[PDB]
RNA sequence: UCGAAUUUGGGUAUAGGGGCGAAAGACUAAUCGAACCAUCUAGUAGCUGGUUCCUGCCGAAGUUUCCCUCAGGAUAGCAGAAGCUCGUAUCAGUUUUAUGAGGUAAAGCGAAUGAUUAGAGGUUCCGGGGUCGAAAUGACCUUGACCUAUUCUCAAACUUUAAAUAUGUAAGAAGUCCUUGUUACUUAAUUGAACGUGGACAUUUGAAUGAAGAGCUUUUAGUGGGCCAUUUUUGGUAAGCAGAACUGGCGAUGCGGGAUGAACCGAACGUAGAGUUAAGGUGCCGGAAUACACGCUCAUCAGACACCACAAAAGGUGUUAGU
RNA sequence: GUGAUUUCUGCCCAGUGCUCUGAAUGUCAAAGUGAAGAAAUUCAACCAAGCGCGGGUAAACGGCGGGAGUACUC
RNA sequence: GAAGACAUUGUCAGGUGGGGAGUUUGGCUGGGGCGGCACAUCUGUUAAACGAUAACGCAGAUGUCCUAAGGGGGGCUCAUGGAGAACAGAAAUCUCCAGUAGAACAAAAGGGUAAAAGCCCCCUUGAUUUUGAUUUUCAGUGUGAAUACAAACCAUGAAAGUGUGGCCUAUCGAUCCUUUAGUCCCUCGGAAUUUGAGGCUAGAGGUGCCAGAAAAGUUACCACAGGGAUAACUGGCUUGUGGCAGUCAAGCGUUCAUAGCGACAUUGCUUUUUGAUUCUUCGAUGUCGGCUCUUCCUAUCAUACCGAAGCAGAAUUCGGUAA
RNA sequence: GGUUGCGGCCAUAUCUACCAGAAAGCACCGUUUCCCGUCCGAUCAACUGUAGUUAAGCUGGUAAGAGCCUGACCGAGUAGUGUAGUGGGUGACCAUACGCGAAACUCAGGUGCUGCAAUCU
RNA sequence: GGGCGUGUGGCGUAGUCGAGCGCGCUCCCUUGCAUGGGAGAGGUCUCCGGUUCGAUUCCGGACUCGUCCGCCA
RNA sequence: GGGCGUGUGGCGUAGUCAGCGCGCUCCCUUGCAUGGGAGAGGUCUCCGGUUCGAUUCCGGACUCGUCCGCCA
């Protein structure tokens, strides 16, 4: 009962989010976005691999769900359920419309054609760009060959072209590997639930000393 | 039998055929819309000025 | 149906601005306009009386009438294939003097000063403005400025 | 004005109409196409509020029918004498112009006033003629 | 709406030329006289054969009328008219609105 | 069907909104849901068809507003004709300089509004579930809220910020400066306002470029179905679909090229001669190198040129070059 | 109007018509009557039939519903 | 003989009167009809940062309400949160603190507003008179709405000032006719007085199809002028839907992803489905099905030769060259 | 230079937490007969400048302070965009040519200036 | 052809994952215009698989029944 | 497919930005006839918004009953 994704592949319309002018959309099919060992610390998983688009198109929420299930299932079967952290870095906010025509014989007796042809919501999609990350996984350096294969299996569920790039960053942060290493040898990083908070030279010295004590322990 | 609703095609060409002449400006523009208390005094001021110039160059 | 009211499509045009709402400062009431002054029109949304229409926002005109709290301004409006003369009564919160006119008057008085001082010698005053001429010959030296060779950089991911 | 126009399709059930210069209240509405090409016609069956007669009219749907203004007003009885009720308004105004009802409503109201209940009377105004339709008893404020 | 029964307003009655007290009423049209020229012409045109000779209006759309107040100066008896906007309910009896009291 | 509610001759009666009808709107002289003839009558038609010699010059519109207006008119616009007042300017689909105005593209969300993923630390006179508890505004875990510092992703009807392109004004003589006349306006007041008298400043007189004359008036035709292309863009799965914005076109237009074609590329046209080219081409059709140079490809459906006359995901120790 | 014979033609007069020798001021023309006026005229009373009120009529046009209990009953 | 000043007849007046006559029975519109109002308007957006800008585009709204919810002045600060106080608790009243508006301002939405434009109190009628000018829509017509003055007369405050309805953007109506107010002015044409009538200036009674006809159907008995500007065939563009084919592989298959299948996803093809559109045809292209007859396509049911199997034989299934 | 009265621009001026303030001026402060206003002389009104106090207001300083302001060749000539091609690509879209040119980020600095009149060790 | 829902003892019918009632008649007791009372029998919850610990109950498939929409000019 | 109406205690329903009557269950009184008073009983179909407050005002959803879906 669902149209093929080629009818909604391209970004032909303006963004159409769920708002107080829509008020009746179907809920998204993808619901879980962070999975694997999502409660892991930052220095547990140094390596990060990205599935990144090469197209300017719309990805369906159904396709996002299918790719998430495929990559998660493959990596938990080959490497264990808590050896990786996968994060879906796109969210379906664009709403797809359909002008539903009757498929009955002699439909033109009651069709009215293209008059008042404004559509009804039937699906949700995420609008991506050139070089935008869809999937991001962080793991140890011993799981590179299985997370590349997991992303390669997940790439079949997506239209268009995607690339698998091994990032130069440490995990889900934005510093490089030696930059993060020379930062964490000092005490100016401090862990959070999954992420890490950093020290800055601004701010009040009392707060900067109750937090982050080992760097000032010089 | 629907038809074309509205367009602005060819309109700037039609205007710029013999078009977009600026209005002619003049010395001594019109005093309509100017404040009547100003004009009522301005009449007497010009009348006195004309009488003084006539008496000077009589 | 369609809607073309007096203040249609004037949302961001007649918003005030960020962090300068409230009452207006007293310089706009202390400024003095005379007949023949050239003024810019920018409406103040805080004052609802004497408002200009949305067409005249950012338009520049000439004062022709001065009343108690307002100013009469003449604008030239393109209607069809010609310009028409439009007379507007605007409160003084919606107008300010045009700075280009006072810049030109400063050029006039400095220009007359130059002509007056150089008339005592006759030194070919050359009072017209000139645009940006092509730059002439020069000698650039390498003392402490030996050239540094640059090359194109190879490609990287940078994510 | 006393009365205002309306469209037949704009009319609906339990609404007031003017039929043959009488205030009437609709009980039935039915629309049937005149011809396959043509517009539907509205057949209206209504009951006069004052007299209880059944009046029907059919019209084009696009036609405009006259509609009265009906006001229902709430009063307390003071006396029933000579077939004329005496009523008492909020803020203490009194009217005696209302004639007493002549049917089983009037009989029940007469017996209720004879045996001494405090009776709340609803009288309606439409097109310059006045009548009483129903009565209740005040459950509180005895 | 509600309008008070009296009003101090301008009177151009050639002796006042100022604000005097005025008693207000509502304007009523008055009966259409016979022997008005249009009525005589209409009767002459309607006599004979030919049926109805003039249009009779049917497509009524307004539900209200503009109310007209008749002001009457108490000194020199001169009268003025002024119209108001459209209102479904109108009254001249002054029952003033009161603020901090119950429903 | 054939002895009768039979068939039929002649005479006679009924005449056109009338007749007659065992009823079909049947018949009433090949004419009937109102006969025929003549006149009114050359009835009216916003609708279809046609509209008669040559050459020269200029040359459109399918758009604004109103209409029982939507196949039509009026009105403005576009066009022609007649000119008139002057003689290089009170010009300009242009640039520069100076100065305004704007809320789109972009960006932002550890900034307001709204949406939204994940943990962390706290708050229980201040939650809910279990377990331990006599019970407890009891305890221990868990889960929900709220707060605090973070984190992932967004917005036609969100925004602090904010372009590009378009867009207003000014670049003087109708100007600037000095002095002092008028007034019933205005001021406490010759204070000011406006218009003035007299005097000074001229060809670099106030940026560039170009001007092909500049300005003004009257009158009237046709038109008021448009369509296509690039870019922006709306509805739609889409359409040689429907609807907008700026420009250029076709209509109204031939010529060279795209084999062919209204719109594409090039270029717009008096009659000829010579030369050079545009776009496109140079094996032969076919005018012009089976030129030169470096590589790649062998297809048991090769490929061969924009608009344009289609092909995708996924693969291949085919072959080549790379990381 | 229905359409030989045979056998039957149930219920409904609220609506729309049709029909009364009923009862009688509600609607209520012209003429006529009264008042006011200087008159044109204005205002009232009175006011025929028909409407309106009250009956009849379906071999007149027509019409012949729902909710519970256990065909029947409410 | 009967009847008799009653019938009859004549003229007026009321009723009845499709028996008959005449006429009417909107427009837009992805054909028309039904539906809706995109028909007079308003807010935000589409709208592409001056202005303008379409669709039966999106989200909504109007035919009202108000003697205060208008005008002037004075005092005060709101939503919310925290901490307290008998009954009194989630919500009654009182007190303090924080509080850029997160409240309120009649209504739809968007702007604007903090010693206020909000809440409370005091006084009032400027929601008044006289005609002009200007802005929006625009033909620079009307109507509606609005802006700034002039000449009066007022309100309020100590005053400067403010006020010509509602904080701003919507909230509404020609000619003819009737009626009211003013001037108590002009005319009734042989001359006067008084009624009556007609004029001048300003309002009201209303046309919502909102620049403004007085208006029910049917036609299968039908007619005329036209239209491919416009529907019902084929053909053409598109392929949602229909049909057919792939890729990936969580699983089914005792065990085993792929012998045979194959979820969640995703890429295509076809024009033997039905839609969508309106390009051609309305001075006509004969419109279902069957019978008859020829040829073509392959996405192969059988026959020929083969490969694979969860092929022992028999039977079967999957696939290839093949029309 | 401090302070007061009236201001202009309206955070470099605001906010949070501390510290300091000679002189003068502001301020808190004392009182209810009179004018006046309140449930309440708390606000407002009036009287005294006396009985007192810098505790607060106010001013200034401090803070790897929050905010705000300025600058950068910091990001970045990046994103976006005007013009051009019989450019690439099935397409989606993307390079190049002639031009214009952001925002976030990062870093550095700053934290009221001033007009008129009066008055002050 | 497609969609949607349905399936309980001989019959009707109640079911939140932990098969009851009424009717038929088996027996006994108890009565003209023939009753009542008490103990009875009676299901593979349509079937087949998986989940659970155990499915009427949850899920997937099949069967069956009942509705709704569909050929041409 | 589209449009309209519909749900209030068992029933009838009414309504201002949940009431009675008849049912039900008790009690009391007096026939010929009775009547009275108490209670238990209603998330106003449901869910939101608006509003001091919503049966009432609006939006969305469910159920049921209707009416159209025609020319070729
Ligand atoms: Zn007077």
Q: Which residue, among A131, A100, A135, A121, has the nearest Cα to A13 in the 3D structure?
A: A121
Strand I nucleotides within a 7 Å radius of protein CB atoms: 7-11, 63-66, 91-94, 107-108
Q: Check if the beta carbon of residue A61 is closer than 8 Å to that of residue A92.
A: yes
Q: Check if the beta carbon of residue C87 is closer than 8 Å to that of residue C77.
A: no
Full DSSP string of E42-70:
HHHHHSSSSS--S--------S--EEEEE
Q: In what order do the strands lie in the sheet with C82-91?
A: C82-91, C70-79, C60-66, C38-41, C95-97
Q: Which residue, among D88, D69, D65, D66, has the nearest Cα to D77 in the 3D structure?
A: D88
Q: How far apart are CA A71 and CA A149, in angstroms?
A: 9
Give the torsion sign (CA, A51, A52, A55, A59): positive
Q: Check if the beta carbon of residue A125 is closer than 8 Å to that of residue A8.
A: yes
Full DSSP string of C95-152:
EEE-HHHHHHHHHHHHHHHHHHHHTTTT-----S----PPP-------TT-PPPP--P
The owner of tokens 């007359």 is: C112
Q: How far apart are CA A161 and CA B1, in angstroms?
A: 47
Which residue on chain C is closest to B23 by alpha carbon? Answer: C83
**Residue A141 DSSP symbol:** G
* Element containing residue D6 per DSSP (H, E): strand D3-7
How close A53 gets to chain C, by Cα (Å)?
A: 13
How close C83 gets to chain B, by Cα (Å)?
A: 6
Q: How far apart are CA E103 and CA E87, in angstroms?
A: 24
Strand H nucleotides within a 7 Å radius of protein CB atoms: 26, 28-46, 50-69, 110-115, 117, 120-121, 124-130, 133-137, 139-140, 144-145, 147-154, 162-163, 165-173, 176-184, 196-199, 202-209, 213-219, 229-230, 232, 240-242, 247-250, 264-268, 274-278
- Residue contact B19–C67, C-beta within 8 A: no
Size of interface B-C (CB pairs under 8 A): 32
Question: Which of E58, E59, E65 comes nearest D1 by C-beta?
Answer: E65
Using CB atoms within 10 Å of the CB of residue A217, give its burial: 0 to 12 exposed, 13 to 18 middle, 19+ buried: exposed
Q: How far apart are CA A115 and CA A92, in angstroms?
A: 30
Distance E9 CA to ligand 1 centre (A): 9
* Element containing residue B48 per DSSP (H, E): helix B36-56
Helices (H) and strands (E) in chain C, counts: 2, 5
Q: Check if the beta carbon of residue A50 is closer than 8 Å to that of residue A128.
A: no
Distance D131 CA to ligand 1 centre (A): 46
- Answer whether any strand K atom is within 7 A of the Cβ of D63: no
From residue C159, how far is each of A136, A151, A168, A173 by CA, in Å?
12, 17, 7, 11
Which residue on chain C is closest to A51 by alpha carbon? Answer: C159
- SS3 label, residue A83: coil
- Judged by a CB distance cut-off of 8 A, whether residue A186 touches chain C is no
Q: How far apart are CA D1 and CA D10, in angstroms?
A: 20
The owner of tokens 């730059």 is: C135
Q: How far apart are CA C37 and CA C74, in angstroms?
A: 11
Strand I-proximal residues, CB under 7 Å? A 10-11, 55-57, 130, 160-161, 199-206, 208; C 19-20, 25-27
- Judged by a CB distance cut-off of 8 A, whether residue B18 touches chain C is yes
Q: Which residue, among D41, D126, D132, D136, has the nearest Cα to D84 in the 3D structure?
A: D132
Which residue on chain D is closest to E88 by alpha carbon? Answer: D1
């Amino acid at each position: 009962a669902r149209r093929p994704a080629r009818c909604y592949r391209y970004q032909k319309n303006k963004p159409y989010p769920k708002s107080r002018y829509n008020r009746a959309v179907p809920d998204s099919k993808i619901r879980i976005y962070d999975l694997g060992k999502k409660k892991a610390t930052v220095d547990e998983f140094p390596l990060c691999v990205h599935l990144v688009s090469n197209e300017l198109e719309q990805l369906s929420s159904e396709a996002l769900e299918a790719a998430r299930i495929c990559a998660n299932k493959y990596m938990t079967t080959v490497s264990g359920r808590d050896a990786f952290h996968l994060r879906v870095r796109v969210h379906p906010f664009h709403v797809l419309r359909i002008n539903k025509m009757l498929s009955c014989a002699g439909a033109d007796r009651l069709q009215q054609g293209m008059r008042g042809a404004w559509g009804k919501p039937h699906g949700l999609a995420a609008r991506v760009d050139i070089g935008q990350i869809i999937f991001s996984v962080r793991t140890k350096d011993s799981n590179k060959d299985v997370v590349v294969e997991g992303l390669r299996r997940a790439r079949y569920k997506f239209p268009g072209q995607q690339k698998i790039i091994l990032s130069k960053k440490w995990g889900f942060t934005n510093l490089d590997r030696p930059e993060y290493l020379k930062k964490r040898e000092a005490g100016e990083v401090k862990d959070d639930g999954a992420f890490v908070k950093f020290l800055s030279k601004k701010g009040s010295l009392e707060n900067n000393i109750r937090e982050f004590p080992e760097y000032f322990a010089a | 039998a629907k038809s074309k609703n509205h367009t602005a095609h060819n309109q700037t060409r039609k205007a710029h055929r013999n078009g977009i002449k600026k209005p002619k400006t003049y010395k001594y523009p019109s005093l309509k819309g100017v404040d009547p208390k100003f004009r009522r005094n301005h009449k007497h001021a010009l009348h006195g000025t004309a009488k003084a110039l006539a008496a000077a160059k009589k | 149906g369609k809607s073309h009211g007096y203040r249609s499509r004037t949302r961001y045009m007649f918003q005030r601005d960020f962090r300068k709402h409230g009452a207006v400062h007293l310089s706009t009431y202390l400024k003095v306009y005379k007949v023949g002054d050239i003024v810019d029109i920018k409406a103040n949304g805080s004052i609802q009386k004497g408002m200009p229409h949305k067409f005249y926002q950012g338009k520049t005109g000439v004062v022709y009438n001065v009343t108690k709290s307002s100013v009469g301004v003449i604008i030239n409006k393109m209607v069809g294939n010609r310009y028409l003369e439009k007379r507007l009564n605007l409160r003084v919160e919606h107008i300010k003097h045009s700075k280009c006119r006072q810049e030109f008057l400063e050029r006039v008085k400095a220009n007359a000063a130059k002509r007056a001082e150089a008339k005592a010698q006759g030194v070919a005053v050359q009072l017209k403005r000139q645009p940006a001429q092509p730059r002439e010959s020069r000698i650039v030296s390498t003392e402490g400025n030996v050239p540094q060779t640059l090359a194109p950089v190879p490609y990287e991911t940078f994510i | 004005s006393a009365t205002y126009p309306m469209q037949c399709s704009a009319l609906r059930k339990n609404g007031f109409v003017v039929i043959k210069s009488r205030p009437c209240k609709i009980v039935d509405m039915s629309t049937s196409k005149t011809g396959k090409h043509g517009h539907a016609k509205v057949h209206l069956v209504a009951i006069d509020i004052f007299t209880g007669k059944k009046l029907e009219d059919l019209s084009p749907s696009t036609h405009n029918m006259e509609v009265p203004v009906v006001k229902r007003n709430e009063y307390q009885l003071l006396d029933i004498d000579d077939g004329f009720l005496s009523l008492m308004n909020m803020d203490g105004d009194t009217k005696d112009d209302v004639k007493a009802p002549e049917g089983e409503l009037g009989d029940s109201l007469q017996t209720a006033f004879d045996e001494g209940k405090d009776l709340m009377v609803t009288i309606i105004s439409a097109m310059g003629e006045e009548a009483a339709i129903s009565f209740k008893e005040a459950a509180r404020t005895d | 709406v509600n309008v008070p029964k009296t009003r101090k307003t301008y009177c151009k009655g050639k002796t006042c030329r100022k604000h005097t007290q005025h008693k207000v009423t509502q304007y009523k049209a008055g009966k259409a006289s016979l022997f008005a020229q249009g009525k005589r012409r209409y009767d002459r045109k309607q006599s004979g054969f030919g049926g109805q000779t003039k249009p009779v209006f049917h497509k009524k759309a307004k539900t209200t009328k503009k109310v007209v107040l008749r002001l009457e100066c108490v000194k020199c008896k001169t009268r003025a008219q002024l119209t108001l906007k459209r209102c479904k309910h109108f009254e001249l009896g002054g029952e003033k609105k009161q603020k901090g009291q119950a429903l």
